Symmetry: D2
Subunit: 396 residues, 4 copies
């Protein structure tokens, strides 16, 4: 990875993360993505939106978004019609795999300026009617919830990912109480970062014009919802009685987008750009689909080896909190202390727009490294179907 051309991150930006049918539910996935792309580019002194050559953008539940969500994000952000645009689906890892592909396109010399990231509007995922073309002569028919079908259900076993999270808790010995106390801790971290202004730089607030007064959405919607007594008292979500996974200690359904701007070494010099960070390496891994929860335990070492960096040298990790048990299990398998993980809180408290989260956690990681005066960061995100993606950055 050192024998390959350098890839610099010159900026990043994210929408606030809205709740399901909540503050951003009126916006489509390309509207969210355009907002993030435009806000990331506005931060780069000396780089124009017309300089962007290629876009990779993650998006999972693309039904009814229209042709090529990434293209719609790029044009909506004001990029040139000459821009090459590709939508990426690696379920929950989409937004990070998009960034990997953008880096590679710089490395093979086919671009010098790339925007990559991801977007998801789970609020605007439709329902499906699958048999209208051939007809169904007689009998009740099903309207398929696109979130469940294309976002949250493992294709092999037809099992919701929350059921496989329960499998993870049983496999690795994590109780209801260990998961709940993790969830409270990560909500408290997200609230603390919010209150301290530590998301202000990375978030681009959204202005919703009134149809009626305008509305400005500035903060992530979920963190303020923590109620520790109710969190500890709620019923399980997937297994009655003996269940350990709950709605409060799991990720929610959410709307949001995030974007990074990548440039080659040559373009960084030509335009005299100030780099925020360097991409040191990455790794994808996969295992049995129902064990997707611990695929980051393969991807993270793979990315660290690609980067030539030891695990102990990392100053901060972003382990995406698909569920509280996912963070607990990868911390246990890798031997990573929680005091190095999701220092501004994670998806259980912040939200999980699935096509965007892989880029969202990288944006947040750069903020964590700056706030905590760190240098080396690693983001790792599991995905439905058994996979995970991971990436190592150096703050400059």
């Amino acid at each position: 990875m050192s024998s390959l051309p350098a890839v610099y991150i010159v900026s990043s930006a994210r929408t606030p993360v809205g709740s399901f049918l909540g503050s951003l539910s009126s916006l489509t996935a390309p509207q969210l993505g355009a907002h993030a792309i435009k806000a990331a580019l506005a931060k780069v002194d000396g780089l124009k939106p017309s300089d962007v050559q290629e876009v990779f953008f993650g998006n999972v539940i693309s039904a009814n978004v229209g042709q090529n969500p990434a293209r719609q994000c790029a044009l909506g952000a004001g990029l040139e019609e000459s821009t090459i645009c590709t939508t990426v689906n690696k379920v929950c890892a989409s937004g990070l795999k998009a960034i990997i592909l953008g880096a590679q396109t710089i490395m093979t010399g086919n671009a010098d300026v790339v925007v990559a990231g991801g977007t998801e509007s789970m609020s605007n995922a439709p329902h499906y009617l699958p048999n209208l073309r051939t007809g169904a002569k007689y009998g009740h028919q099903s309207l398929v919830d696109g979130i469940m079908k294309d976002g949250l259900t493992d294709a092999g076993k037809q099992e919701l990912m929350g059921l496989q999270a329960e499998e993870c808790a049983q496999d690795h010995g994590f109780s209801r109480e260990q998961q709940d106390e993790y969830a409270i801790r990560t909500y408290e971290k997200a609230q603390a970062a919010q209150k301290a202004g530590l998301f202000d730089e990375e978030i681009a607030p959204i202005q919703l014009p009134g149809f009626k007064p305008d509305v400005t959405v500035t903060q992530d919607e979920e963190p303020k919802n923590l109620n520790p007594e109710k969190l500890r008292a709620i019923k399980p979500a997937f297994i009655p009685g003996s269940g350990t996974v709950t709605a409060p200690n799991s990720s929610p359904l959410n709307d949001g987008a995030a974007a990074v701007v990548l440039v080659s070494e040559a373009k960084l010099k030509e335009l005299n750009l100030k780099p925020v960070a360097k991409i040191l390496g990455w790794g994808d891994a996969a295992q049995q689909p129902s064990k997707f929860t611990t695929a980051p335990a393969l991807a993270i070492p793979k990315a660290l080896k690609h980067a030539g960096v030891g695990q102990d040298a990392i100053d901060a990790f972003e382990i995406n909190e698909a569920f509280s048990v996912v963070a607990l299990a990868n911390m246990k398998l890798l031997g990573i202390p929680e005091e190095k993980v999701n220092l501004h809180g994670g998806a259980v408290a912040i939200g999980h727009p699935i096509g965007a989260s892989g880029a969202r956690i990288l944006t947040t990681l750069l903020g964590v490294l700056k706030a905590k005066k760190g240098k080396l960061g690693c983001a790792g995100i599991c995905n439905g179907g058994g996979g995970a993606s991971a990436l190592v950055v150096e703050l400059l």
Copy 2:
């Protein structure tokens, strides 16, 4: 491009292309994709399915296919659960961009064996109900056709691709008659290739469990040519003065196609015999309603990346989204039809949109062998304004 690691195609395969609601409509997109991947790997002596490290697979209309169509394609083909899988959507160019991404992943050293391609089941694209979560208190509502919404409608103009085809005919001066005679010629070429056995190698027949079992061996569309009916049919998108018709356009279709890519080091380690070498590629884009002529940008870009002159190409595959698309790109690039789509194109063969980018590459490798060519170029336009192109050398 020549200063980066070499990428070899060690095999390729495709399903037959089925008609809309036709011979393959009982199969899902991952079932077609798995079939193509498995058939491509079976052709490589000395390479096991367990050697495949990563998959990139195109798919456009992914609604109701379930999580990660490419992952389902990979597992259904018998690949290991360790395999990295990413689904790609660049509309009609998805299958070719997937192959580009696979090649890049070998070039950056992150894989030595990659399967890439694409799949589409347009038969099984659903309809959508968009406002059931928040409700709609009063008034008639709509069920959105997923093919129209996510496959065939330009987002900015909200116009179907046939109307962009008419823009192409007006912008580059191709009449109804010119488009029809082009369409007849490409159906004739596809039928001739069919009868001469020239698709037998690339196609992996599909066995449908039975009633007794049905085997689908042929592409469904080529036989439908009726020249008298084609010249007489009413235009499909503009009454009276229109030039684009259903016969002279690509149809809606089902199918998949796959290539197997290896690094130079792995080729030597496993003593594999390569079919072709990837020489270069290029993506380009312009005004979305003008996507029809984006190949006139992408093809020269791919040739420059490959370090190959246009005159040295022995055969081109220019995807026939419409007959007028091939006519316009041939005119703009100065490519004679005698070098284009030598076994016919998508107007006659079919156009499963997420697969066609890989489908035309598989067919191109067959054309280079049959016609004793060495250098080939595939170029495919895509809704939204883009095109992708790729240059190969037959070994």
Copy 3:
């Protein structure tokens, strides 16, 4: 009694062919079928104009997406004056017969002199329902509800199909799969024999379907020809696998069709010098436990006979609507009515069961059976989902 009230005569009747589900008449809406039967029945009355019709009662069960007031649509479609009073009637399977009863009563209270009554059903064009689109449903798969199942064939109380309750009737009164299959065969044969002899030609009004250029004509009922005894005795049970006795071939099908009768008061009959086909002697509705609707005609039939002052032995022909073969079997046993006097030209198991129309359909057929077999007194009885039944006694003139 009835004799203290004005007389009510039937001067004509007519019915469409009964089409199969998604079959020969699937292109026609329920009011198109109803208008066709109304026009045909009126064309048969010498001396009576369509403008003479004052009020219409018409049955229709699955009215979803039919539009405002199906009976008004049937009446205006048939060329009746816009001054016509029109009411649609839903007593599920009994709708067509209760409409005729309400029509008779409206003459008897002196509010009309010429009434057209009947029923119609297009089960092919029954839609699916999206029940919760107004308020939304935030998350989860949802249901598209089959309107035939919901509004036509499911008991509201137990929320179970009528077939499963036909299965319950079989266990209650001791009728086997073989006993139901052998009945089904016999009524299919009576239906085929009646078709072959042309005994349906008078009552049926053939339907023309416009072509490009010539016209397709539906002249025959669609279901009778489908009898296959080998397949019938060998088919899997429809509701209870293994031990079930109710099957699709021995049950009534889903069907499209309509039927109509014209009623006049005694004054109009002589004021217009009309030849009356039959006189309405009495009628009777009854109801019991919803899941036991199958034997409800066993209450309604004797109640109708009593209202009409007529004995059960005096009846020359019975029409007992064959919702299921066991429905006809059980009511024959309960009342002690021999099959030799029941559904002599076949019943709904072979002819079809367009549910809103069948109560009028069996009356039209009953009039034809009395003419053919040279009887004078007839009784039609039809059960309906929910526990009820309706019955009517006529005298052929």
Copy 4:
């Protein structure tokens, strides 16, 4: 013919569209009104009711025979004869007429008749799933528009027929707004004076997930009057020049109402005290789009069938399908508004179409009691060109 007596009557509160009663189905509302009216009759058991006629227009997804569900939910015997009647907006009154006829022909001694409608729970329709639609966007039909508010011949909503009525007889946006404001204030004054308390049976909606219990006692619509907002709201059906608006029209509503009828002989046998006696009725019809003025035919028909003069009626309930409907009918019959809808009308109270025919008859008896009157008449127009009218004498 035998005399027919009203021994009681009851109605639910009239809920707003998707409002205070939206959680209840049409049979639950109907059962509530039936058993409430039967509770008012001392000496008459619910087991004494032999037959039920209940109006209901938009019956889709209500289940088998709405009237039967109303009867059984109200505690009536399974032996009860139950028929659902649809004469659109006149269903609730035509049901009552059919029940009186069933007593007059001596087939019943105790009949419950009325109407119910849950417009909140009217579904949308998918009409072509059985045969399918191969390619194209499709429609979901709003059952309220299709089966309730659209004339079948002209395919136009009732509001456009109301604009016809305005240009037919000369009633401006200001005249209709003035009437709407007047009927709203008569409704609000009756609420404050308790004049709806006897007829309305409140509904208990208990929440037991920790939620608190909710009792609906008031009609939801009368309080919504805002004359400033009303006068300045844009037209509803004809932009700029129309005269019909949502405030001056009836809303969409949920509600039910029932009457208990008995024969002359049963009144004497059970020693019951009759509230009123049905004197006569009349149905009439004309051009479907001119249904607005159809009460101008049925109201005289009902007065003549009953042997009562128009100058002899103490109070009229002319159902306000639109404010212009009341104004037009008053003009053609020459009826002073000081004898019309003395507690308000459907423009302010609400219009559950299948129930309103019984609802206005219930409110009429409360008018005749409060105003100390003897003869009341109720007329109600219905879609399709018809109207129903009924004449009562308070006892």
